Design an enzyme around this catalytic site. Structure first.
Site, PDB file in Angstrom:
ATOM      1  N   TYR A 156       7.114  14.598   6.058  1.00 32.88           N
ATOM      2  CA  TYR A 156       5.875  14.187   7.022  1.00 32.88           C
ATOM      3  C   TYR A 156       7.156  12.387   7.070  1.00 32.88           C
ATOM      4  O   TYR A 156       7.137  12.074   8.329  1.00 32.88           O
ATOM      5  CB  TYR A 156       5.118  13.091   6.524  1.00 32.88           C
ATOM      6  CG  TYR A 156       3.781  14.580   6.092  1.00 32.88           C
ATOM      7  CD1 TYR A 156       3.081  14.406   5.045  1.00 32.88           C
ATOM      8  CD2 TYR A 156       3.251  14.660   7.367  1.00 32.88           C
ATOM      9  CE1 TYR A 156       2.820  15.404   4.630  1.00 32.88           C
ATOM     10  CE2 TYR A 156       2.394  15.807   7.205  1.00 32.88           C
ATOM     11  CZ  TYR A 156       2.385  16.077   5.642  1.00 32.88           C
ATOM     12  OH  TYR A 156       0.545  16.889   5.870  1.00 32.88           O
TER      13      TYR A 156
ATOM     14  N   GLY B 127       5.884 -10.840  -1.843  1.00 29.69           N
ATOM     15  CA  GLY B 127       5.877  -9.846  -0.812  1.00 29.69           C
ATOM     16  C   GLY B 127       4.349  -9.501  -0.588  1.00 29.69           C
ATOM     17  O   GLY B 127       4.244  -8.206   0.581  1.00 29.69           O
TER      18      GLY B 127
ATOM     19  N   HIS C  74      -0.737  -3.778  -2.871  1.00 28.13           N
ATOM     20  CA  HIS C  74      -0.439  -1.320  -2.582  1.00 28.13           C
ATOM     21  C   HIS C  74      -1.027  -1.482  -3.551  1.00 28.13           C
ATOM     22  O   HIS C  74      -0.884  -0.225  -3.162  1.00 28.13           O
ATOM     23  CB  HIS C  74       1.377  -1.689  -2.333  1.00 28.13           C
ATOM     24  CG  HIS C  74       1.913  -2.748  -1.185  1.00 28.13           C
ATOM     25  ND1 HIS C  74       2.512  -2.328  -0.829  1.00 28.13           N
ATOM     26  CD2 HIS C  74       2.010  -3.429  -0.832  1.00 28.13           C
ATOM     27  CE1 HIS C  74       2.840  -3.039   0.504  1.00 28.13           C
ATOM     28  NE2 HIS C  74       2.647  -3.690  -0.334  1.00 28.13           N
TER      29      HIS C  74
ATOM     30  N   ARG D  52      -1.370 -12.050  -0.281  1.00 32.09           N
ATOM     31  CA  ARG D  52      -1.546 -12.729   0.202  1.00 32.09           C
ATOM     32  C   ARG D  52      -3.353 -13.316   0.066  1.00 32.09           C
ATOM     33  O   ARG D  52      -3.484 -13.414  -0.552  1.00 32.09           O
ATOM     34  CB  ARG D  52      -2.176 -11.376   1.509  1.00 32.09           C
ATOM     35  CG  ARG D  52      -1.335 -12.095   2.787  1.00 32.09           C
ATOM     36  CD  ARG D  52      -0.687 -11.556   4.322  1.00 32.09           C
ATOM     37  NE  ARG D  52      -1.918 -11.657   5.093  1.00 32.09           N
ATOM     38  CZ  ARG D  52      -1.615 -11.057   6.719  1.00 32.09           C
ATOM     39  NH1 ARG D  52      -1.848  -9.720   6.756  1.00 32.09           N
ATOM     40  NH2 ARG D  52      -2.393 -11.584   6.811  1.00 32.09           N
TER      41      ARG D  52
ATOM     42  N   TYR E 296       9.883 -13.827   6.108  1.00 35.96           N
ATOM     43  CA  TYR E 296      10.675 -12.764   6.737  1.00 35.96           C
ATOM     44  C   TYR E 296       9.572 -13.600   7.773  1.00 35.96           C
ATOM     45  O   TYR E 296       8.922 -12.535   8.412  1.00 35.96           O
ATOM     46  CB  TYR E 296      11.353 -11.653   6.397  1.00 35.96           C
ATOM     47  CG  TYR E 296      11.928 -11.100   4.581  1.00 35.96           C
ATOM     48  CD1 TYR E 296      11.391 -10.525   3.665  1.00 35.96           C
ATOM     49  CD2 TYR E 296      13.211 -11.291   5.095  1.00 35.96           C
ATOM     50  CE1 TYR E 296      12.369 -11.361   2.746  1.00 35.96           C
ATOM     51  CE2 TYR E 296      14.166 -11.524   4.331  1.00 35.96           C
ATOM     52  CZ  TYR E 296      13.504 -10.718   3.053  1.00 35.96           C
ATOM     53  OH  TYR E 296      14.723 -11.314   2.070  1.00 35.96           O
TER      54      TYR E 296
END
Lengths: 279, 275, 275, 279
Positions: free
Chosen positions: B17, B132, B137, B170, B189
């Site tokens: 993909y 990060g 995830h 987060r 960032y």
């Protein structure tokens, strides 16, 4: 409702299908390039030196095994593939021997057949001495549109990588034979002997009376199963495709399994290898 | 009838993909990190040198951008990720500066959270970083969080006696309660892409279970998903991972965090020291 | 390479997913309605006869079980659904009692909410019913509820001057707020299947957007989804559908509903009369 | 994350793929049974009456068009299919003429080949006089397992529906011819002439040297596209499959397009029709 789009990775996550039965067993498959045959090494090395080739473009280098041979024999090699999955092993090895000076100079990049002009880099020079596309990779490219014109484009771009007077070396399995026996048996690769024992199911797809695909479903023995597809290039046709690609201004001959091939001969080769020189 | 199995490449063929409209917009997203904020650099460098950390493991390094900072600052870094498609950019850069001695010594390998012990290449690491919001995830596919327990145990076991784990997430307390994860809020960032984000919360059996962001950023779409870890619960996950023999504190956006404070942070960062 | 297109049958071949483990457990679910509660029968029969309704349109009749009750009670019923797979059981039963005169006159046809005017077969219907929380099956794919507006307008336009619309929805106010849609709570048909249900709430951009129930019921799984219509908002949708020239009241579980009441209902039923 | 399981409907919702381009155009396709040919009607009616057939089982009745002919000619018909999608039109018509006494007695039910014994109903009698499976439906059944044994089972069950002394009437297109020209052209149905004009792409799938599937991609002219697949039954083989199904205790002959077929004849039939009588 997929949780992430198709084709997008994420930190600490395997890419989509990296982890499946089929992937795990296909990797075992491209990890059997540990026996280059003696006849192949002596013929490729001999051809490239008969013609004074120094700068070589390996197209669809996959894991980089023909290329590593070239770098070790003193050629100035640039090696490209579209598949990051395969390119990863090439890049690994260069990194390991990053400290041998021959490997420092080894160029490895991503390219796609369809955009090959834009993708490959060309030194304070222009134009490769020989461009090789061996191992039946060209046949990986499907005829999705239907009229073969993607094959036309791809071969135009490869063609255009060959400098004036230089060579294109490009092979396909013997699809004449395959279509006619209905089988692509294993154990036939003349570049790398395997010692895996495999069964293969061979599926031939004929659209509107023209063969269109050959699909191989492998079982390898730990019993596991993967599938790969090929476009069945018939000899007479491919030669034409190649002729069209240089616009007639070229010199062409055909080897069957490294040896000269004369139509009608009794030996039926596993592979046909085309060597063209641009005029 | 696929023509090739899922997950198997082929010389001179883009992997499955690689070429889609989502992929080619997500690699613009992975590439909009060209401005590590001054604040973050001064904090991480500060925390690592305060503690005497020299040999560091960057877990989920993605494009390797935090790691490049560390290599340049004189640390001995090994950087791993599961994703070959992100790792490719880390590897590229090392190769380009292969000629600087710091980068010769930069170690970069594949690893997966679930087998992290076997995968990473002696007597521990000094600090292990996972920053990060990468940990988020990792989905809870099974249902009971038993995969976060294992992952954390593997990360944990990378940390030598007296060393640190730095690991962030987060502020999902706040997201769940506004129902929104707004963009522009990365403290590591600064992007200059302008983006719209649709926020989707999935609650299974009254427990928040997934947060799925549909980005729009030349207009086009991709999607990323996240496990909504609540502050109190993550702290506990981490405490369980060291078996209680550890010290823990919480920053909110690089600053000390006291429950109740009026400043509502974008990120929570845990710094744990193994005892 | 499918071997036949999606959605195309073939003599002596089960249609695409007829045979799966989900299908063959969902048709046990569609078939566990063999006990229309006494309360419901007395209410619907009461409301229809109070108003002098004779000719009735049953929208989303599914297996036709409310409609069979109506046929048996002397009403002139036309019953439609979009689903051929549920309509098949309605049609079967009519055929079996094809020989009773009431059932000769029972009209059963296909129709879809979005084209309901063209589909249903004179000067209006007396009452139009849409009960069992069928309306909630209809998703808001576009995003702005513009498909519920159209559907409701088509249902609305089936109702002659002075006639009724009776249309219900489960109490999604309450579901959203507990995060749970428990089973056993159908007031129309008592099951005696024992079931577990996982409730999933999907909130997009702070608006509830889907409720997805994963049933377990010989153990095996299926899934059904629903749009979570809140009471205040549905009332408005319906008011907009008649253009304000209508009278509206709300039952909770067959009884008058006054906001604030302590009895928290399983279902809200709107009865509107066109003026 | 599908929002409902595959294969589950919901009140006021079209079933999964009812609404697509392909569905909408396939329905136009099975809605062209408005011209039964005269030669077919006179041959089926003639065969069933030469043999005294009264009770007939129409297998894979689809929309019910052969069956309606039978009910109108005085036969006691039971008509089954696996497809609810097609059965819906059969059931509709019976309902419309529910009031003609011949149609009151028309039996219509769901059945699957693989369980055909359990599924079909059999009156105060037992055993059908003739069982018909015409229109090339049997070929819809794929050989998923690989060894044709689903064909074996299906034909056993159909077989077992035929009473002692009764007939099985069962056809397939001429796959001998198709495989050999590589085409299944349109306009060839000998039961129902269409007046739609169609293009067809014909795809032949050969696995390990045995033809395994024939897939037809139709374009109909409002330009639209759908796909249907078939198992390519070769004449010699099918005859055997049928023989095995009655265990040898039967009488078999072959028609090509309604006429006797003698191997070697110059006329190449579109369809082969097998008439077997159980002994």
């Amino acid at each position: 409702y997929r949780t992430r789009s198709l084709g997008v990775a994420a930190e600490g996550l395997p890419d989509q299908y990296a982890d499946g039965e089929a992937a795990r067993v296909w990797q075992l498959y491209i990890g059997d390039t540990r026996s280059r045959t003696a006849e192949y090494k002596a013929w490729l090395l001999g051809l490239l030196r008969q013609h004074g080739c120094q700068r070589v473009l390996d197209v669809a280098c996959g894991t980089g095994v023909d290329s590593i041979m070239l770098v070790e024999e003193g050629f100035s090699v640039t090696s490209v593939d579209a598949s990051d999955k395969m390119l990863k092993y090439a890049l690994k090895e260069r990194w390991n021997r990053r400290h041998e000076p021959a490997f420092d100079k080894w160029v490895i990049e991503e390219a796609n057949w369809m955009t090959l002009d834009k993708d490959v880099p060309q030194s304070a020079e222009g134009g490769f001495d020989a461009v090789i596309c061996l191992g039946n990779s060209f046949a990986h490219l499907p005829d999705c549109k239907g009229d073969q014109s993607e094959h036309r484009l791809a071969l135009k771009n490869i063609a255009s990588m060959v400098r004036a007077g230089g060579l294109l070396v490009i092979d396909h399995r013997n699809y004449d034979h395959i279509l006619s026996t209905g089988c692509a048996p294993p154990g036939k690769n003349i570049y790398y002997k395997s010692d895996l024992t495999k069964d293969v199911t061979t599926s031939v797809l004929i659209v509107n009376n023209k063969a269109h695909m050959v699909t191989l479903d492998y079982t390898v023995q730990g019993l596991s199963k993967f599938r790969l597809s090929y476009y069945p290039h018939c000899l007479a046709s491919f030669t034409e495709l190649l002729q069209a690609a240089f616009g007639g201004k070229c010199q062409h001959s055909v080897l069957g399994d490294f040896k000269p091939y004369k139509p009608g001969q009794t030996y039926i080769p596993c592979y046909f290898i085309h060597v063209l020189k641009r005029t």
